[PDB]
Design a protein around this ligand. Structure first.
Ligand code: ZN
Ligand code: ZN
Lengths: 51, 51
């Protein structure tokens, strides 16, 4: 329930950061976005495993 | 408009994990949601770095 909603949010954030980092032309902006993305992907795995 | 949308998403996320953490009565679960909450907060900050 609350976990499914959290999951949906992450997937979306994951899918949004992926696009944004790929298009980012500033190197600093890209590295930041790509870095936050690793985090989102990780959050998804964390959500899949606690239980 | 990417940074703008990323930013809101992080806030929405932060609201769901706080609410999720607080209701959590399983110690482990709570530690996980609170840990990610912490990560989402970090993200808001990094985004302001390139805002
Ligand atoms: Zn996340
Ligand atoms: Zn985040």
């Amino acid at each position: 329930d609350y976990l499914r909603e959290l999951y949906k949010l992450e997937q979306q954030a994951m899918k949004l950061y992926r696009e944004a980092s790929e298009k980012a032309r500033n190197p600093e902006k890209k590295s930041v976005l790509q870095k936050i993305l690793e985090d989102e992907e990780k959050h998804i795995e964390w959500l899949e495993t606690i239980n």
